[PDB]
Design a protein around this ligand. Sequence first.
Ligand SMILES: [Mg+2]
Ligand SMILES: [Mg+2]
Lengths: 251, 251, 251, 251
Amino acid sequence: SNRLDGKVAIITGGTLGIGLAIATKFVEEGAKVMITDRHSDVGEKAAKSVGTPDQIQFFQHDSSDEDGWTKLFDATEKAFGPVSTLVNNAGIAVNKSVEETTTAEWRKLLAVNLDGVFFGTRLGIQRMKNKGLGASIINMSSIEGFVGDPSLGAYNASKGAVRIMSKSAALDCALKDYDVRVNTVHPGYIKTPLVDDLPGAEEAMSQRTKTPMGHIGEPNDIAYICVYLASNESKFATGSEFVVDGGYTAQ
Amino acid sequence: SNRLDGKVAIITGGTLGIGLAIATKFVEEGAKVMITDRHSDVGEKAAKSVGTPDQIQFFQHDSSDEDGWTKLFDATEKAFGPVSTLVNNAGIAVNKSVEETTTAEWRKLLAVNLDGVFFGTRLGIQRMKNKGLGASIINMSSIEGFVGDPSLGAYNASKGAVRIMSKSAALDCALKDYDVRVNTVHPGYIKTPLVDDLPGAEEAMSQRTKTPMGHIGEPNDIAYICVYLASNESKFATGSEFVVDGGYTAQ
Amino acid sequence: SNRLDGKVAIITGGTLGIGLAIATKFVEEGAKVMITDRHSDVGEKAAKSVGTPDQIQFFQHDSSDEDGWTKLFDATEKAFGPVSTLVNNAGIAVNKSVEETTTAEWRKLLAVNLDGVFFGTRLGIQRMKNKGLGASIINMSSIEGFVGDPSLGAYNASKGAVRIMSKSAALDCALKDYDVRVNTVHPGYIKTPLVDDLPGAEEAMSQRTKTPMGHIGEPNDIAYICVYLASNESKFATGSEFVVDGGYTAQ
Amino acid sequence: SNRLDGKVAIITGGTLGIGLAIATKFVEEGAKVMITDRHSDVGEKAAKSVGTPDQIQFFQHDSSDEDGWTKLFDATEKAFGPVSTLVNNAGIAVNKSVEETTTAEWRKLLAVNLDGVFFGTRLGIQRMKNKGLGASIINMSSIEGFVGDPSLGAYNASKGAVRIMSKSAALDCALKDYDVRVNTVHPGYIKTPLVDDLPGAEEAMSQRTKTPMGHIGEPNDIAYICVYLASNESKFATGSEFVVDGGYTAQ
Ligand SMILES: [Mg+2]
Ligand SMILES: [Mg+2]
């Protein structure tokens, strides 16, 4: 409890699965939270299921929407004060090999998975630097950021981009003493909407040959590592990659 | 000599520096070559300086231009026969931190560095698969694909994407027995015409803290590794990353 | 608090610096702790400074001493019950390049840094498996396990071995459902007793060219990540590497 | 041809499989070669099957034998002149998980796989530095140096050690302008005599879930990459890892 005391966090795609879990644990640790999503209907209900308006609120926003990012930060700051933590968790997947990926699919996935993370990270640095907030930007990546998958071409590209782009940002912040850390989280297959949208994915990735533990993880598995990265407990961690994949990339 | 016998290669951005060196060594090894770039002035002059039309030719093209990619393959195949080797070397850089990167700069760099490589790789697989050519796609990455640089935000992103996207393509090709290999080359600092126009550039790059050897490489350093990857000598190498950085990433 | 409720942990080299910090946080989180070292004086004094005998105790032991490992587990189990957590933190360093390393120095460093971790890990698996303890083995590595250092030849070797050997153990435990997780922690430069004994050491370590943040970390920086890995919060994390180096390996 | 003109190489375990292939390609490229083996039953037959005494010879030696290393360098230098290339290829494997590994098996495997490579690398640097030979030390590693295997505990450890230890050596040599490069080769599964003796070995290694290409490699696959690393073609490559695993580590 209170591991995130005084923190003010923004979690994109925090109305379901992983995002929702992170929001729940964040509030549980004393942080003010603002979750985002493109569906206001479910948004409001998700925030309320986690806590009261004084601890968590919802803000309709598409991570690929650049201008919206500024409005998202203004609303969050106006409601809870200066933002200190950002979790770029919103993302989509396309079940296509590089060979069979259409340019439309390619641009659509990168708009969210890459441009969106870029927009959030860029603005996050500008808004959270030099304010003694112990700012932390957590960029949700994936095991798909370390290894490839024959049917996740576009996805693999976006995740590999986020992985290294985050290091660049981490270095710049550290070298300029911005008081902003940047790190990536690389979830292995986790029981969530994105995976439960990928035909037979959970069954396939439960096989011992894919996930050594013989089962996939749960949203809280990612929420806990995010709490650590959001808290001052990891004040010396920046530009690092934290994997929680049940052994997937160990073999 | 003849380490690339019978090969037909396409080299984007092969009219200068690294690209030109790869083209030179490729022809030298018996491969038919087609180099590209948007500048026909230097392009046509470059091809002729390497060899005659029967061994090497120039094709004006912007790697970011999707439709052009099909015309590029048709022209090459029409001149030398079925393409068997593709080197995605064309790329640009922006000297900006993630924080100071404009969306215009971001999209412009990704259009060439990411979309361009995606377009080439996707079309390459479709055209070079299942033809007993011993097809090989070499995606030029960088050390900036392994580690970040505070002032190369966008660049880092595109190189990180190419790095993992290439593994995806490598896997799909192998698993489907397409007879197509996909690997990435990660050059460290290389002494090129552009580098010479920047006062103190090579100087800073040669600092022991950056490049342990105390000096940067030359175009041929990258050409030689590309020869190996283009030849049947590396028929068992796919989805791998080959670094030639003077020890940059060793420390 | 109580993030390690019911846990029984063994921490080698837990009488000073990092080890002592891990022990402090562990007890603080409700875990019973047994620290080890070769100096009884400092050891007993250390345990008592952290807590009472019912929560923490000391056991004189050399991690390189194979037989002692069994006595260490028996004493810990006899005092607090079945061991569920093992932190292989004891290690030594030699300031020598590979070229100038004597065979005696080489064997001496590997005896502790490699054999010692092997002994603890091997026995740990045998003793902590299949007991519903949520067992966790944390092998202390280093940034020197990812990158090399011209003056830490032997050290680099032992850290590189621990890094991959741990993945092997992690996989075997997961595939056999031993209820035992294995992960490595890779600290960057940390303000340890040794570092403070070397005039100007923290200075060289703090150079931006080495640690981007401009300063080294503190013992608690490593203790916090160890708490996460020891708790059920990371039940889906195994065979992974967690880095806390102030940006050292990011560049 | 003549890609290793003037080179004088030593290849440990060069009387069979990979080692023999490397020796064959080296001589074929103009290098003088000395192959070693712990045993002498095929040493002469092997060298003679590759070429005449003026191009290749055999020297009985156990890589774990420290003193023998000096005699090996003297014999080679006496026969062909100053050694310029060293390939630490001799190694052994134990099919045991970390949990089931005996201390005897542990020490035995490390003596050859780790100590042996250390002995060769250390002496190599001392003997080949500052002589304008374009010296190159190639330390044979494995995919088991990047990822773990539940039944190769000790093996994983030794390969992870060689992987990082090599980087240390590479840095020291580069920083001190020793004119010695150090790199590692990480073969995936390779069809070797030993493999043919294990029933169903190639079958299990050819599973798509293990090797995406659906088949393992051959000795020449490793010989070719070694030629590149031994020649001046890779004068700017040092401290790097070169993987040829048929896509094993790509997924
Ligand atoms: Mg580095
Ligand atoms: Mg893998």
